[model samples]
Target chain A: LTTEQLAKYIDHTNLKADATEADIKQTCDEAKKFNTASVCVNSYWIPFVTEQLKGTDVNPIAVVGFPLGAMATESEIFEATTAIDQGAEEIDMVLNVGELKGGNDEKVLADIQGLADAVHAKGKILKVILENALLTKDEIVRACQLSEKAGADFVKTSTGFSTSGAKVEDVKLMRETVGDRLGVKASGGIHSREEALAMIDAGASRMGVSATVAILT
Target chain B: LTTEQLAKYIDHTNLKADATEADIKQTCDEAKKFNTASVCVNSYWIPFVTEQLKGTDVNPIAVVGFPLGAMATESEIFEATTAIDQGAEEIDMVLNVGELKGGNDEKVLADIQGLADAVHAKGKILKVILENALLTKDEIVRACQLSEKAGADFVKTSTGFSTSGAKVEDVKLMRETVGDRLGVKASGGIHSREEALAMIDAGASRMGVSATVAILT
Candidate 1:
């Protein structure tokens, strides 16, 4: 029952560059069993995942530029359109990782909002990944402002594949910045149910993790 | 005499977002008048201008992915193939700006190599733009390494109009990293002849300034 309760808030994710259709099907199967909140697979797998989980309660969340937001706006726009076309219900994207580090608050804001708009334009929910592993605390705070201003659906912690995983301080900072304006997500190396719940307690409305099965046990 | 001499090395360029067909023509005339090396235009105008310069010494240089350098490899490859088909004698492709920033050094290197291979397949010269204004000193150094390894003819800085403009320090750092094995191109915000000269003095074999008349005068 804890697995079921835990899955209620879990965003079961698989963002590896080489993730296969079978991997996503397996992820969707786990989420189906646990009844996770969303199956957060890379955009490339959105169509297959959506098809496999056609009858399930779990929403299909597609991700663009996973783990790092170092893409061109036009390309992100294209990706957003294609993903939604492929039947993605929700979208998670990494903000321009370099721009955030450069402190170009304006472009960073525009970049995050740009993708969010593309997703929302299609009536899809948008979650932005800060790649918190690569940014300083203050920069993370600055990024959150853009998320709120851009009407992002969620502000997330990390992609779990960067320099280091998520930090509690950064999560708290994201919560403070967005408050109730947007949901917060903590991802990257968060494998256990306890850690996932801890992130939720710290204001994470969504959890980005591949260990839906791990957390269930 | 010096203005003409310097202008001969200049590539009268107009790849701005709002640049028009008339702008591309004006750019070519200016390059002809100044006896500039090449007239650089966005990829779309390659065929139009390539015909205009067929009998003249001024070559046509088309940009791949323009300012962002974020297109998928297939996209860049298509742009290169078409431009070359349109008689683009000189190719200035943007290095994957996001990849460089994300420290995905191998992908960046491989991407540049892919571009270079495509350009040369059509007997064209490739000038790889690093968009140095968006990179750290360490990133600049690494970019040079990868560019050299990728066999790019030039390691250019900036697509212009990025977070920060080109700097003397970056040019010098790029020079130090690539040594005599490669050439440097300093771009972004160098609107004055004096600034262009300074970047050149700093080790930029080519300057990517937008103010062609200002630089020559």
Candidate 2:
């Protein structure tokens, strides 16, 4: 694919706990420069990112219950809505890893559904991060199915804060489970062009990447 | 120090994202068996922990905005109060690493103050985790000062999910900065008796440890 085509699949990311305003500004600048799909950041930076990417084709995405999805469903919704109200075009939230692992599929489904309803009500899309490193193969498949059932627009692979990030096999399995119903996003630790292309080839419709400039270049 | 003495300083912890009912129950049991000071877990586990530690000396401590403190101050307060309502005896909230690093000291102080007030009004203690791995020496001192100014009961060194955990010098500096005004908790990557003792020697008043049974044994 051409560089411009590949750029459209990239969500330029800066979710570091220590990311400064200047750092976020640079991410927005890079996203705009490459005309990436979106600029993903922590919820707190959504407003700043939105302003920075103003009038650009690049959307502003906010991550809620980030890295760890152990918080209450209401809290995640509050976070997501707050970001949306502040101009975030899309919301990416982490799945309740403990609940899913504890066989509380119902609770997990409810969690995603609540957020999905809230985001959808505002006419925004939602991406559910499964944090694949913490889940088994079967668990991953179950999570994808649950996300699809819960009305999520996309199923994302990792938060990058966990033990590992996106994997080729996991992306393939996620795509296989969701089929053509939901988009598949592969994020975390994907730094090079080869890795990004491999994820796309494996059926990733979107990529959450921090190395967008280098990868595209 | 004697095993019992060391146990009194340890907050038997299970903050892993995949922590299950069995895992938390075992942590509570171990905390009771060792007569540890507290049993620390994610906010969602507070009620379960309180139930498990019922009629026991082990207090239930909940980590709010855990590992990452990028959420809004109101959200953090909500999480802390929710945990308190669930019967958490103590609340350990993460310092907003991005805000602090951005040199927004007032925002950081207000963030801690709001949570501290809510926790204290409930007659519960609050510990501010600086996540020292992400801060400079001066930032650490400033964070401790803010915690103290905000009336926090403790200044903790790490969230254990960051790049690194507690360090001897960090614990020492936190102790020196807070002095007798507040407690100092050394957490993250503290595995053995030797390491635990060293943190205590460096002026850690409490320990957030996952290896409680092994360390005591």
Candidate 3:
């Protein structure tokens, strides 16, 4: 694919806890320049990012229960709605990894379903991050099936804050499990063009990368 | 100090995203054996921790808006209330580092005050984690002041998920800033007895550590 074609799959991200206004603005500028799918950041920066990406095709994406999805379900829903009200176009939420691993499939499904309904009502999409680095293959498949069943729009790989990130095998397994029902997002460690292309070939529809310029160039 | 005296200062923790039920149970057992101040885990484990520590002095502590304090204020409040309802005796909340660094002091204050009120109303205390590794000395001092003014019970040093953990200088500065007004908790990267003793010398009234048994021995 050409650079422009690949750019559409990128979600230019800056989710650092210490990211400043200037850093968020730089991420927005890069996303707009690349015409990426979205400019992803913590919920606190949604308004600023939205304002910065005004009139551009780049969406403002907010991460809810980010890096750690241990908060109450009501809290996650509150976060999603607040982000939407603040001008976020999409919500990327972390899956309750512990609950899923504890054999509480119903709880995990309900968590994702709650967020899905909350964001879908606002006409925004929800990406359920599996944080695949911490999941076994069977667990990954179970998570993907639950994401699709819960009506989530995407199944993302990692939070980038975990032990490791997006692996080709996990992406392929997630794709096979979700099929075309949910978009697959390969996030966390896709640093170069070669890695990004490999993820796409493995069935990722979107990519979350902090090194947008480096990847594109 | 005696082993019993030192044990009272620790909050034995297991906040890993993939921490299993067995791991949490083990942490609770260790906390009980050592008679630590609390067994700290992510909010999801509050119910289990509370159950495990039933009829014991080891308090069940939950970390709200943990690791990253980027969620909405309402969300944090909801998390605190829910955790309390689930039997958490104390809440250790991450400071909104982004807001603090962005010079939004009022937002930061309100954030802490909201959690403090929610937890305090239920007769529980709050520990405001400054995640000092990400802050300058000035920011650390300001955070300590805001936490105390906001009615927090303690000012903690790190989440153990940041670039760095508690430092002697940061803990000393935090103690100086809060003086006798608030408790000081020096967490993260504290392993041996010497390090623990040094933190106590720097005025840390509480210490968060995963290696509780190791340190006590």
User: What are the per-residue Cα lDDT tens digits for candidate 2 across A1-217?
Assistant: 9999999999999988888778889999999998999999887778788899888899998888777888767777888888899988899998888889999899899999999999999999999999999999999999998999999999999998988999999999999999999999999999999999999999999999997888999
- Candidate 1 chain B TM? 0.94
Error of 2 at B140 (Å): 1.4
After superposition, candidate 1 runs with Cα above 4 Å error: B1-217
Report the lDDT tens digits of candidate 3 across residue range B55-143.
Answer: 99999989988888876677778878988999898999999998899898998999999999999999999999999888988999999
Clash pairs, candidate 2, are none
Best by TM-score: 2
Comparison by TM-score, 1 against 2, better one: 2
Q: What is the lDDT of residue A212 in candidate 2?
A: 83
- Model 1 residue B53 CA deviation in Å: 21
Model 1 TM: 0.55
Q: Judge the docking of candidate 2 as incorrect, acceptable, medium or high.
A: medium
CAPRI level of candidate 1: incorrect
User: Native contacts retained per candidate?
Assistant: 0.00, 0.62, 0.62
* Predicted candidate 1 versus true structure: per-residue lDDT over B119-150, tens digit per residue: 87887778888777666677778878888888
Backbone clash tally for model 2?
0
Summing lDDT over every window of 10 consecutive residues in candidate 3 chain A, give the lowest-scoring window. Answer: A66-75
